[PDB]
């Protein structure tokens with residue numbers, strides 16, 4: 001379970017993370033290289049290598065990632081808003097191949113988004 | 115139906131857009147101010163003002179937005195990947211209050227994502 005990436009070990013709790021939320025479907029923790037005052041990730045416990053590999057049945061799960069993201073943002077006091085990001089492949093900047101949702105806030109986010 | 119924002123009119127087809135996909139749940143069209151070679155949006159036909167206002171029942175719908183996004187990206191030939199973005203409120207850069215998913219590709223996306 002969890003797969004064989006950095007996030008797989010985090011899921012199996014082999015290596016700790018700053019976990020801020022956990023249910024039977026996903027886990028959320030602070031990003032080790034924050035790009036904003038608040039920057040955490042929300043990942044599914046199910047191993048999906050990347051958004052392009054997600055299937056139609058994974059819709060609820062993917063939406064669950066955003067719902068959890070809005071809740072955690074709320075717990076962390078992000079009243080002025082935030083930005084959610086999902087990277088896919090080389091051009092997307094994906095380096096860990098386990099789907100993850102970035103949630104950034106605590107400052108004005110710029111445009112373009114990279 | 116569709117709400118009363120710019121996207122509401124697009125949904126009701128009162129004002130045209132470069133529609134690239136449409137089903138009973140959502141619509142996808144090219145962004146009028148592209149930040150990358152390929153830059154389109156995926157929006158739900160249901161009016162949700164912003165991600166923070168989405169409810170638990172909207173999970174499948176939100177995930178559907180990403181599934182459609184990966185499909186459209188595929189149709190548009192984005193083999194090297196892409197980045198999906200959802201902005202929330204002031205800090206997120208949201209200016210149109212109807213949930214929308216940005217999908218950017220065609221070039222290397224940078225970090226931080228704004």
Ligand SMILES: CCNS(=O)(=O)OC[C@H]1O[C@@H](n2cnc3c(N)ncnc32)[C@H](O)[C@@H]1O
Pocket residue numbers: 006017029030031032033034041087093094095096097100225
């Ligand atoms: C956007 C770049 N590429 S990425 O889209 O693949 O996102 C991966 C993110 O996970 C990260 N990461 C790697 N190891 C850990 C860890 N132990 N805890 C938290 N985050 C981690 C990086 O900080 C990075 O922001």
Ligand SMILES: CCNS(=O)(=O)OC[C@H]1O[C@@H](n2cnc3c(N)ncnc32)[C@H](O)[C@@H]1O
Pocket residue numbers: 111120131143144145146147148155201207208209210211214
């Ligand atoms: C990221 C900034 N803020 S935003 O997160 O709110 O995204 C809104 C996006 O919808 C846009 N937009 C407004 N009118 C139209 C239209 N008729 N067709 C396509 N896109 C439109 C802008 O280009 C913008 O990129």
